[model samples]
Target chain A: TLEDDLNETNKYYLTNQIAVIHKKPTPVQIIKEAYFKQSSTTDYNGIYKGRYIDFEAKETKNKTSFPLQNFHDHQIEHMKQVKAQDGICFVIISAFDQVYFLEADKLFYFWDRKEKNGRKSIRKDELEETAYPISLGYAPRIDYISIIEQLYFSP
Target chain B: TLEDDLNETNKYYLTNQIAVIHKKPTPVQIVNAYFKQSSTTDYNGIYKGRYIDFEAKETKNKTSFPLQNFHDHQIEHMKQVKAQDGICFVIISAFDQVYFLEADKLFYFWDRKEKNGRKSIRKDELEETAYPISLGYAPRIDYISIIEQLYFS
Candidate 1:
């Protein structure tokens, strides 16, 4: 699972004191429950280089396109809130054989266009062209932080 | 009541777009749970351009702050956050008084106790080391202001 791999990557980073990413447990209103295994919002968040890092992860087997329906409106709003505070935001899409990292700004651009009758999903070729590919590593499996620094904090 | 006030403060922050802090939903490593209401360590979000995380607890004791009140995992989490250069702390309330204790400070005392066979921090010791946070009206508990001055500033 990408989540399991990401979880382990975060564990490695946390132990090495390189970053503090964590997958948020499911967000539940919990109005009622008798005895349970449970469950909201985004996938993971934490700090890096004194800035907040917020993101969601999605996996799809689709060959040419990844559906935008995978994301909820509320989650997009949450990402907006984080961005308003100067946090770093992005999405990690596991599409077939590769992993792509797309910025929240890019995500919102597509989201806003979809509202205006644009394509309902992002083309895999489009992602291959625009989204940054995250190489897998041993310790920090995804090495997304390296991509983050290069993109967001480049000198 | 403290939890209610803190919740309101977080809501206030969120609504005004000041920060994105939230209390982590109860962490029940499941095969799972059914409950009426529950609470866990108040945790993560972006605050003032930094990822802020913390926990809060209150005790009625007037003499000392006991180590037993904090679970080992919570303590470990705090340690991990601090190591990552993230701001981590605890809000400790004794009766009507509230104090913000940095995880580093807590770690110091906790380590000393483990090494020296001591068990808890005396009230006087806490007062000397922690920052006192006065309760406010509009935001109820504007604890983040303390964080801003102590950390981000």
Candidate 2:
């Protein structure tokens, strides 16, 4: 239900055409589905100034640290692939405890840490050090694009 | 897992630096789950110095075509998007019966044919008019980027 709420908030932003933004869907390697009920979810691709935009969404409830296990191998590779094309690829990590946003690039850097055999978790302090925090608002709910506007585009 | 394949192919394209593209996840009003599945799907967006893409995939078994490829909810939303300076779209009949990628704008036009609402796009016509990208390795799929280069850009 929390995920649905976040998605609806995203739809609200998309419908308004506030910015060319979307939550990129996961590229699942589903071997099979038990199919209690059939449902579909998001993937990457959207237009922003005629450029392809793509990303994933993640969330956590921790107050002190964010788990690296939150990401899947495929998703990380997928993000790498998007970045390969120079697409505006990123992620939205909502700290439910604080209800704030952290960019994917920051998370990817921590991933690099693991590749070099560093600590697994990104402490909340570390996230605070690297990520841009977005305060939730009315209408769009998660106005992360405002943060994007500040960091990557016109502020 | 048609949707899954679409994503893998897109990811492959992104990774290989071929072309950047993605499909937004299906919007759901989730009531319950053991763990909330994070989603990031939306209908449309920009690409490559131009508005990039939007699509709704479907399957058809008919020899000619089927109007069933187009859904009411998707069509209506696409129409709404078109009104707001967004590119509306669909990629119908995926890998079945010659597989066609019909644009949302074209689908909308055909849907408006109240007098001939049952009409569907012919396969031959689509082959002739729509840009076709044969499947490939690394990406292992067909994308409309080449078509965009030819038709719009």
Candidate 3:
């Protein structure tokens, strides 16, 4: 129904405190920042149920595949630290046209693919088969946690 | 010897996974964006713990501050969040000229002064009485975890 699905979900997480997530600001590894001082911004971190959660959010718009270039090496390494800590780690994948949710494990599966010199994109066909469609709603428009609850806390 | 002493300690805590601490990205209101396209970056989230940490790191060459780095609504909402759940919070006051890290709590007390029609923060007085960091080699950069451990767990 609209264009910004990711933001809606972000607001949901922030307000509900299910997980305090935010869009991270780019950290310019500035050996010299005098010229860029006024241009910089902040990074993402927050409290969700009294836990310290840290991560970066990314999105790619390709019907056929999601690019590895969309992610940074530091971010991937950070995810590894998160996984090691028994933290709930995952990426939120929203395919605009198909309108579905692919959990983080699936993306990490593909994230490791490139280590073997694998292809760059996660073929849309694969996503169509693997992802669960999150039905759009009106009230709390972006309801993504249902899938998260299903994936992480299911009995 | 220098100012804003606790940043490196905070960095140590973050890197050790003692806590997955990070600063929040600047919040974008998004008046216009590429529909069905990616326009912004998500800066922070949790991995091992439940809390999200963030800060606005500023280095003041002069003492009195400017309203350029922070938004009023951001400050208000952050306070509300602090009350609701007590997130690991504070600002990193880096006096690059003197190399210090003043806590945000202290910084905002001055910040609010401007709102109440007062002057910005002072440098010489701050130097006379602010936390000083002696950067060592091991951690390379220490940060706020020393205080966090003391305050929250």
Candidate 4:
């Protein structure tokens, strides 16, 4: 699962002091727990290079395109808020074995289009053309920080 | 009660775009939930162009705070954040009062206790080392203001 792998990556980043990223807890409205603890937000968020980084990771077995149904409206809304505040916001899509980091602006563009019943999915070829592929490795599993540096902070 | 205030404060920050802080979900190791999910830490975000992360707890006792209230992993997590140069701390609420104790200060006393077998932090010691965060009505809990003065200023 992309989340399991990202959890490992975050743990790696945390343990080694490489970064302070963490996967947000699954937002559950615990109506029955003796004690209540819940988070109403996206999957992952933290600080990187002194900047707020927020993102959601999704995976699809389909090779042709990633469906819009995979993303929730609230998650998109949360990303918009993060972006509005000048935070770094993005989505990581794993199409089978390939991973791509798509910026929040790109996501909002397509998401708004989807709202109008336009193309309901982002074609794999389009993602290949537009998003930056994230390399997988041993230590970090997903070396997302390097991609973040290159995309948002490169000098 | 403090949690409620902090939650409101985080919402205030989010809606107003003052800062991007949030409480990390409670970390859970779900063996079998039919659905699975997890989280850790109390709060974190970007503030004053820096990454801020922290944990918050309240104690009703008047004299001291027991170490058992904090998990070992949580303490270790705060250490990692401190090492990363992120703003890491613990918010201690004693009844109606609140204090922001930097991870460095907590680490100093906590390490000493570990060596000497002392099991809790004396209230006086905590009061001396931590900063008081005044409660606000609009934001409810604006600990960030104290954070700015203490760490960023």
Fnat for model 4 comes to: 0.45
In terms of lDDT, the best-performing candidate is: 1
- Prediction RMSDs, each to the true structure: 3.2, 5.8, 7.4, 3.3
Q: List pairs with backbone clashes in candidate 1.
A: A27-A40, A35-B33, A35-B34, A36-B32, A36-B33, A36-B34, A37-B32, A37-B33
lDDT of 1 by residue, B69-126 (tens): 7777777777777766788888888746888899989888877877776787788888
Per-residue lDDT tens digits of candidate 1, residues A1-155?
99998989888988788887888766544435434323235878887877789899999999889899889898899988888888899999999689989999889988988788777788977788779999898888999999998988894
Q: What are the DockQ scores of the candidates, in order?
A: 0.62, 0.29, 0.27, 0.42
Tens digits of lDDT, candidate 2, B17-113: 5555555443333234123333321334333434445554555444445655545655554554444444445544433422335455365546555
Cα lDDT of model 4 overall? 0.79
**Quality of candidate 2 docking, DockQ:** 0.29
Candidate 1: docking tier: medium
Off by over 4 Å in 1: A28-40, B32-41, B115-117
Mind giving the per-residue lDDT tens digits that candidate 3 earns over B1-153? 222233454466566666554433233322331122112212233433544443444554455544444545455545545543544343335555322333355445546665677554556655554444344664433333333444547
Weakest ten-residue segment in model 4 chain A by summed lDDT: A30-39
Ranking of all predicted structures according to DockQ, beginning with the best and ending with the worst? 1, 4, 2, 3
The candidates score, on chain A by TM-score, as follows 0.90, 0.77, 0.67, 0.89
The local lDDT score (0 to 100) that residue B146 gets in candidate 4 is: 88
Chain A only: give the TM-score of model 3.
Answer: 0.67
Give the runs in model 4 whose Cα sits over 4 Å from its true position.
A30-39, A115-117, B29-39
Over A1-155, each residue of candidate 4 has an lDDT whose tens digit, in order, gives 78889989998987777877876655444435434343356778887656778888999999788998988787898888778777788999999469999998899988998677677788987788888899899988998888888878884
Q: How does candidate 3 score on lDDT?
A: 0.49
Relative to the real complex, the DockQ score for model 4 comes to 0.42
Candidate 3: Cα lDDT at B5: 33
